[PDB]
């Protein structure tokens, strides 16, 4: 949905729960970042154009997502 289209309701709140997704890593839910990665991978993939999926929220968990198992 956040990579769907341009109707655009719920933009920062989609970024907001994305911050909440990382703390499942200390729970051992491996896909939680891995889907968050593969979405952010697909955020990085196929676009390479815009700072959508707001690049503030796109930059910083990309860091800790590199420092993972």
From Swiss-Prot:
Q: What does this protein do?
A: Essential scaffold subunit of the transcription coactivator SAGA complex. SAGA acts as a general cofactor required for essentially all RNA polymerase II transcription. At the promoters, SAGA is required for transcription pre-initiation complex (PIC) recruitment. It influences RNA polymerase II transcriptional activity through different activities such as TBP interaction (via core/TAF module) and promoter selectivity, interaction with transcription activators (via Tra1/SPT module), and chromatin modification through histone acetylation (via HAT module) and deubiquitination (via DUB module).
* Protein name per the record: SAGA complex/NuA4 acetyltransferase complex subunit TRA1
Indicate the quaternary assembly: Component of the 1.8 MDa SAGA (Spt-Ada-Gcn5 acetyltransferase) complex, which is composed of 19 subunits TRA1, SPT7, TAF5, NGG1/ADA3, SGF73, SPT20/ADA5, SPT8, TAF12, TAF6, HFI1/ADA1, UBP8, GCN5, ADA2, SPT3, SGF29, TAF10, TAF9, SGF11 and SUS1.
Which residues of the complete protein does this chain represent? 2359 to 2427 of 3744
Q: Where in the cell is it found?
A: Nucleus
Give each disulfide bond as a residue pair. Answer: none
Specify the domain of life of the species encoding this protein. Eukaryota
- Similarity comment text for this entry: Belongs to the PI3/PI4-kinase family. TRA1 subfamily.
The organism encoding this protein is Saccharomyces cerevisiae (strain ATCC 204508 / S288c) (Baker's yeast)
Gene that specifies this protein? TRA1
What remark about domains does the record contain?
The C-terminal domain (2233-2836) is essential for its ability to interact with activators. The FATC domain and precise positioning of the C-terminal carboxyl group are required for stability and function of the protein.
Relay the record's extra comment. Answer: Although strongly related to the PI3/PI4-kinase family, it lacks the typical motifs that constitute the catalytic site of PI3/PI4-kinase proteins, suggesting that it may lack such activity.
